[PDB]
Design a protein around this ligand. Structure first.
Ligand SMILES: [Zn+2]
Ligand SMILES: [Zn+2]
Lengths: 105, 694, 145, 90, 304, 105
């Protein structure tokens, strides 16, 4: 008339057995049903912590002459940095010498 | 478009013929049914919160039993009503009612008498019933307690009010003050969070955690957290009157149910059965409860009623088994009456935390409107009124404890009752919340902020006045942060909040305004037949076993209550036959239910399930379900899984399942009034929306 | 590779806590759609306007330094171009669809904010919601910090 | 030590047996049919229920030809065990 | 590389004049001689901090139980450490995978067996917080080791079979092992995080390889002189040039560290304004701040 | 395509859950069931208490108390027989019990 619980729980009540210790039988606390410590050989708990399992032309161009190198085409990016009352703001960025100037419209 | 859609009366083009007519200047006998859909969430919420919710919030006040000299005085409020505003008694007058146009011009408050039936009883025998004037509460104009209720537009010009008087506002000392709609977290739902501020809360915590905003019948609100720990152990935090409580998970689940520990083991391992660290951790959490000699439910209840008795402020005569069911009644999952469905909910919060900590489900974005709802003016009225009723009872207790010192004749009461004259009067502590906006509570009412609740409805023009009744304010504490994520436009606000209509300075991104089609769900219905309907479909309930294994089965969560386990090959076919009941109004499926089937992909997507929401105070918007041909109230979380279409040409076969009503539905009322919005730039529109309001 | 396999690879690039291979698919759409943002402006802007400079008043205000730029005129009479949002294309949802109109993980540049319609003729509603994101981004990053 | 082995029940009492069968032989295969909450069981009273897959079986009350759908299953080792009363122990 | 930009760098220079600054760099060009270019590929590698949570793939903890006598009953652990392959880092020291095993065999386990015997040797709470918020050489390390097994064909794993006794509570050895596995392996060169020679940039057509490190150790680079042209060195740290190259070159670093803060943001300031700030802050010989602790040097009480 | 024949007879076939594990070992275990008295109300057809005594422990199972499962009210349970000789799945009525072991007071 024995049941099939997990190894860590009693199989007459459902309460949790404690850990092993100073004896050969681990006992429950509310039914006195004792199980051998030899039955806990197959208690193998695994854990795997994983660290490293696997292992734009800066935007569109516009024909604007660069201040430094004099290249004919700079790449731009717009961004609205003032309030909603006025303006946009255009950030140019050259292809050759990578120079970055801004304008406020 | 469907007849009855509220948008069938949308004009083809502008007319201009309505200002050269003989009808111009004759008041109609029917207010217009399109200007009244803008204060509907303000007025219907107050209607629930002075009639039904007040009777459901004097039942959740427990009986007030305290100790006299070896007797036991017991109070309870049986019923509480609010009268519509009249003149004081003794006034020689002809029309006894008081109308709002008097209270604006005289600069007083439009307020109604609150009074209740208290039931005093000594030593358990019911020995009286006293009708006690508690105070005056403010009445919303055009609600079911205003004296302008259901008047036609000609009888409303006679009482000095405008025709098209939409309501939504309190007259407090002559100044009209609306309660705006704050964003609260999504009620009765696990929200997977990752916050590294939680690592410094206890000894060995982890960032991972699941929160829940719990609300009971629109009148109480409590947040509770879970926390993953590096052991695999789960904790459970909750604040009860500025006292943060720590509580392990086994101490909650053993105190809730009388199940054996093998079933509490089994409920927490349902999907993840081959795992080895998880079974070890859910063994440790129950072993912790086994440590202190707490093997049954009553022993855990005595233990937690002895540890948590001095800060719960229970009386000096309860058994500790009742002073521990007092904390599960008011702090842990208040939205479920059963202690069994609190257990089956803490198991789902715990398993969402396990699948979040292992990195198998992604963080639910707390700032996205997928996981956000709105707070209506019926919630903040009913919550604060409930708390002040309890505070009135506590003030009666303080009146007796002050009458005991410097002792009077002090006889047995027998309806003597000069104490109720000396009780606290909630005229002024209830007026203060409206008059200043400063919430004053020993609880916090489940809200994350203290000020910024009532806003003066200014009326400089009519563009400004509408957009106090469409405002969705994110938070009155996020204005001071250096953040950008809580004030950034996200694509899940399509149809529910307006992209352009927000201010541009410091309240940018916080003060959102609703779109035109969007609407707050305020009608409260009952969910009795829906669990039996689901189990008549393929929902195998919790206690039985599904015919396929778990991890090939979705949880089902009907408005905070765990219901069952749907097989994987049935859950698409259940999410269709619950939209094919909502769009056709069948089998008591409400029209505002969110059938949300988060699918099983096998990748770290959202936590899979079939989540059915029916509660109020959400956001919802109408679309056209193309398969039937009828209007569907898509909610905030359904439309991250639906392929809606804007234009008829963009409707394809098999891919497209819905269609928006009219293609400019994404815009607010005020941002529609901008002519040719699609040709001017976006901060021009965001600046025009605050030109028109000036 | 079929499009479901590539779509599964880009779902796997998404949803991961690396977010490095997902910021590399942005940087390969944002190249291929700016080889179409330039080929439009070479066809419409210099010699394709209705009146050219000096007759054109907008080109006179732009080229003589009065107010404008050669970017605002291209947003008026050619495409608006790619909408970048704090450096990248606009955010996919928690379900991998760009906006409720668009299919989950849709390959087309219209899903990532490539507006390709002007302020002259008109902006359709998705290309408008993306544009409002890019405007609120700048107004928030000014108003807060 | 001293377990209860309870027999204490104030409003209750034992019961006799029923005249059903008591046999589980080589031919009898135990099926555990799980029915909806309002299912009148004479609605299938001569119809073929499937023993594999799924099949839209017909009802009786509304006369609908695919009103119910009987889902067949597999060996689940369902923990419910039948207590069929026997004739050797009355 | 990245630096600190804007006002909290200008305040970091002029207002606090910090000894410990956030993101400090160091820049040395290369001789452009063919012998001294093979060496810089190795020297970029020999200064990067290779950490153990950078070459490790996964930790595989496996707790069991083992009992043979009335006292000999134990908790057998097993820590299988997969290391990431040598092909997946060609930027760090050419750290050939026998070295990340000899690190384990020498000095990981001395940290592990000290963390173990610091933890258990002297969660469950209801406290009501009243506020709001060689295998014979490895076995020689301790007798708790039962077994050691490293990979021989390749060089990728390691299994300590730690055999601990029984306790009351079961502590986590996937929390101690993970927290100890955030630690420097063999050489973190003292005050240098990473090195970046990937700049082949030039100003007047030089093809000048520029190292640009993320940390500051001046005498670490002084011993590489046939490969690094130390005549043209640079730093952010004024306190690491005032104490190595003098105050009269910690004054041609203040000017460049103000100009290269304004010129990130497009602003250009005339050098006659900056050389008045460098010749005021380096007036007393030390690098004083312009704050409440640089007004004590002044003479007028009505200005202080 | 296997098929059968539905034949509903009507008696209750009691079905047992255990709060601690599978049974897996039938032996020397008593089984008695304790219905309610009054048949004028429908409590005679609803109230029932199952007793399953073993020499070690004894198990009590209700239909009304806090601990009774909600799979017999929100769902109906049957038991098939499948007499394959005549080819009929003759089907009875069932009810599911979930027994807790009895310890103390
Ligand atoms: Zn036991
Ligand atoms: Zn250039």
């Amino acid at each position: 008339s024995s049941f099939q619980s997990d190894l860590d729980f009693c199989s007459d009540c459902g309460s949790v057995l404690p850990l092993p210790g100073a004896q050969d039988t681990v006992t429950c606390i509310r039914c006195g049903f004792n199980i051998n410590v030899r039955d806990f050989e197959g208690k193998v708990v695994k854990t795997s912590v994983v660290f490293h399992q696997l292992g734009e032309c800066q935007g569109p161009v516009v024909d604007r002459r660069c201040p430094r190198c004099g290249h004919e085409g700079m790449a731009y990016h717009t961004r609205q940095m003032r309030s909603a009352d006025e303006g946009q703001t255009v950030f140019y960025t050259c292809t050759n010498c990578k120079f970055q100037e801004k304008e406020d419209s | 478009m469907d007849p009855g859609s509220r948008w069938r009366n949308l004009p083809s083009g502008p007319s201009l013929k309505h200002l050269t007519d003989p009808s111009y200047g004759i008041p109609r006998e029917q207010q217009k049914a399109a200007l009244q859909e803008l204060t509907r969430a303000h007025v219907e919420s107050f209607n629930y919160a002075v009639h039904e919710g007040l009777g459901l919030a004097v039942q959740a006040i427990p009986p007030f039993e305290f100790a006299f000299k070896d007797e036991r005085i017991s109070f309870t409020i049986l019923d509480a009503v609010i009268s519509p505003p009249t003149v004081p008694k003794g006034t020689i007058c002809k029309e006894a009612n008081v109308y709002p146009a008097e209270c604006r011009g005289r600069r007083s408050t439009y307020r109604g008498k609150l009074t209740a039936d208290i039931n005093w009883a000594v030593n358990g025998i019911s020995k009286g019933i006293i009708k006690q004037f508690l105070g005056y509460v403010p009445i919303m104009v055009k609600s079911k307690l205003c004296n302008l209720r259901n008047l036609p537009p000609q009888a409303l010009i006679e009482h000095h009010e405008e025709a098209e008087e939409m309501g939504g506002y309190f007259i407090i000392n002559g100044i009209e003050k609306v309660i705006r709609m704050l964003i609260m977290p999504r009620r009765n739902f696990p929200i997977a969070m990752i916050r590294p501020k939680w690592k410094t809360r206890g000894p060995g915590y982890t960032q991972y955690g699941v929160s829940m905003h719990c609300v009971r019948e629109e009148h109480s609100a409590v947040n509770m957290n879970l926390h993953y720990l590096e052991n695999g152990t789960v904790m459970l935090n909750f604040i009860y009157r500025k006292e943060l409580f720590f509580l392990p998970l086994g101490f909650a689940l053993k105190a809730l149910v009388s199940f054996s520990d093998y079933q509490i083991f089994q409920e927490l391992i349902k999907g993840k059965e081959d795992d080895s660290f998880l079974r070890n951790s859910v063994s440790q959490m129950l072993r912790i409860v086994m440590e202190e000699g707490c093997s049954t439910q009553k022993q855990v209840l005595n233990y937690l009623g002895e540890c948590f008795r001095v800060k719960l402020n229970v009386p000096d005569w309860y058994p500790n088994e009742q002073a521990a069911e007092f904390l599960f009644n008011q702090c842990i999952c208040i939205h479920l009456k059963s202690n069994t469905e609190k257990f089956y909910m803490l198991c789902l919060m715990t398993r969402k935390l396990f699948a979040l900590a292992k990195g198998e489900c992604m963080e639910d974005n707390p700032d996205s409107l997928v996981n956000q709802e709105v707070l209506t003016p019926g919630q903040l009225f009913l919550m604060f009124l409930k708390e002040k009723l309890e505070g009135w009872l506590v003030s009666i207790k303080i009146a007796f404890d002050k009458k005991a010192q410097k002792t009077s004749v002090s006889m047995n009461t027998d309806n003597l009752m000069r104490i109720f004259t000396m009780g606290i009067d909630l005229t002024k502590p209830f007026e203060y919340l409206f008059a200043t906006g400063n919430l004053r509570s020993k609880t916090g009412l489940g809200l994350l902020q203290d000020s910024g609740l009532c806003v003066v409805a200014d009326k400089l023009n009519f563009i400004r006045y509408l957009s106090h009744f469409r405002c969705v304010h994110r938070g009155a504490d996020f204005a001071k942060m250096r953040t950008t994520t809580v004030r950034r436009l996200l694509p899940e606000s399509w149809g529910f909040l307006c992209p352009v209509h927000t201010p541009d300075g410091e309240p940018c991104g916080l003060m959102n305004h609703l779109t035109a089609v969007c609407e707050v769900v305020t009608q409260f219905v009952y969910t009795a037949s829906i669990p039996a309907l689901l189990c008549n479909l393929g929902v195998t309930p919790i206690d039985g076993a599904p015919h396929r294994s778990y991890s090939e089965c979705y949880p089902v969560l009907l408005d905070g209550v765990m219901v069952g386990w749907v097989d994987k090959d049935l859950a698409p076919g259940i999410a269709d036959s619950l939209r094919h009941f909502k769009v056709l109004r069948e089998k008591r499926i409400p029209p505002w239910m969110e059938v949300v089937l988060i699918p099983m992909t096998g990748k770290p997507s959202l936590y899979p399930g079939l989540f059915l929401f029916t509660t109020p105070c959400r956001l919802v918007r109408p679309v056209q379900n193309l398969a039937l041909g009828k209007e569907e109230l898509i909610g905030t979380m359904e439309q991250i899984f639906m392929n809606v279409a804007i234009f008829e040409d963009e409707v394809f076969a098999g891919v497209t399942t819905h269609q928006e009503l009219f293609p400019h539905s994404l815009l607010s009322v005020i941002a529609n009034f901008i002519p040719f919005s699609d040709h001017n730039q976006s901060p021009r529109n965001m600046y025009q929306c605050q030109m028109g309001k000036q | 590779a079929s499009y479901d396999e590539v779509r599964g690879k880009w779902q796997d690039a998404h949803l991961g806590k690396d977010q490095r291979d997902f910021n590399m698919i942005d940087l390969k759409f944002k190249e291929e759609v700016n080889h179409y943002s330039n080929e439009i402006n070479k066809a419409c802007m210099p010699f394709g306007l209705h009146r050219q400079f000096p007759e054109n008043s907008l080109q006179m205000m732009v080229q003589s330094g009065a107010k404008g730029s050669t970017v605002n005129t291209m947003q008026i009479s050619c495409l608006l171009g790619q909408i970048e949002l704090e450096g990248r294309r606009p955010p996919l949802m928690a379900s991998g669809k760009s906006l409720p109109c668009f299919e989950p993980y849709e390959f087309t540049p219209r899903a990532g904010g490539f507006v390709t319609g002007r302020f002259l003729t008109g902006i359709k509603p998705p290309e408008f919601f993306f544009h409002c994101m890019a405007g609120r981004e700048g107004l928030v990053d000014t108003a807060v910090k | 030590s001293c377990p209860p082995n309870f027999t204490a029940k104030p409003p209750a009492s034992e019961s006799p047996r029923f005249s059903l069968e008591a046999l589980t032989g080589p031919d009898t295969e135990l099926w555990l049919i799980q029915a909806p909450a309002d299912f009148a069981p004479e609605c299938f009273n001569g119809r073929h229920v499937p023993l594999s897959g799924s099949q839209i079986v017909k009802g009786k009350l509304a006369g609908k030809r695919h009103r119910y759908r009987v889902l067949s299953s597999c060996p689940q080792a369902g923990e419910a065990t039948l207590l069929a009363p026997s004739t050797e122990a009355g | 590389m990245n630096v600190t930009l804007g006002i909290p760098r200008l305040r970091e220079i002029l207002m606090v004049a910090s000894a410990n600054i956030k993101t400090p760099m160091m820049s040395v060009p290369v001789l452009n001689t063919k012998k001294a270019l093979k060496r810089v590929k190795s020297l970029k590698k020999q200064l990067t901090r290779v950490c153990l949570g950078e070459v490790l793939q996964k930790i595989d903890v496996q707790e069991s139980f083992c009992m043979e006598e009335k006292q000999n009953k134990f908790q057998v652990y097993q820590l299988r450490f997969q290391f990431l392959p040598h092909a997946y880092y060609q930027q760090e020291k050419c750290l050939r995978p026998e070295d990340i095993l000899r690190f384990m065999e020498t000095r990981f386990f001395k940290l592990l067996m000290e963390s173990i015997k610091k933890k258990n040797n002297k969660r469950n709470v209801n406290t009501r917080r009243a506020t709001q918020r060689r295998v014979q050489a490895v076995r020689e390390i301790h007798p708790f080791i039962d077994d050691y097994q490293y990979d021989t064909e390749e060089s990728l794993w390691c299994q300590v079979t730690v055999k601990l006794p029984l306790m009351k509570i079961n502590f986590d050895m996937s929390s101690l092992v993970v927290s100890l596995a955030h630690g420097a392996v063999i050489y973190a060169t003292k005050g240098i995080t990473r090195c970046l020679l990937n700049e082949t940039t030039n100003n007047k057509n030089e093809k000048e390889l520029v190292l640009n490190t993320e940390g500051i150790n001046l005498p670490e680079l002084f011993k590489y002189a046939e490969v690094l042209d130390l005549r043209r060195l640079y730093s952010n740290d004024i306190h690491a040039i005032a104490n190595t190259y003098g105050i009269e070159a910690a004054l041609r670093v203040i000017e460049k560290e103000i100009k290269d803060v304004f010129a990130v943001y497009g602003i250009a300031v005339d050098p006659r304004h900056l050389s008045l700030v460098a010749d005021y802050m380096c007036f007393e010989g030390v690098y004083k701040p312009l704050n409440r602790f640089g007004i004590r040097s002044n003479s007028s009480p009505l200005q202080q | 395509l296997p098929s059968a024949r539905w034949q509903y007879c009507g008696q209750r076939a009691v079905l047992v859950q255990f709060s601690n594990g599978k049974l897996q070992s039938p032996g020397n275990m008593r089984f008695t069931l304790y219905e309610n008295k009054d048949s004028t109300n429908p409590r005679k057809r609803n109230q029932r208490i199952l007793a399953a005594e073993t020499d070690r422990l004894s198990y009590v199972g209700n239909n009304f108390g806090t601990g009774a499962l909600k799979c017999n009210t929100l769902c109906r349970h049957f038991v098939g027989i499948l007499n394959k000789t005549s080819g009929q799945m003759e089907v009875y009525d069932a009810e599911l019990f979930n027994m807790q072991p009895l310890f103390s007071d």
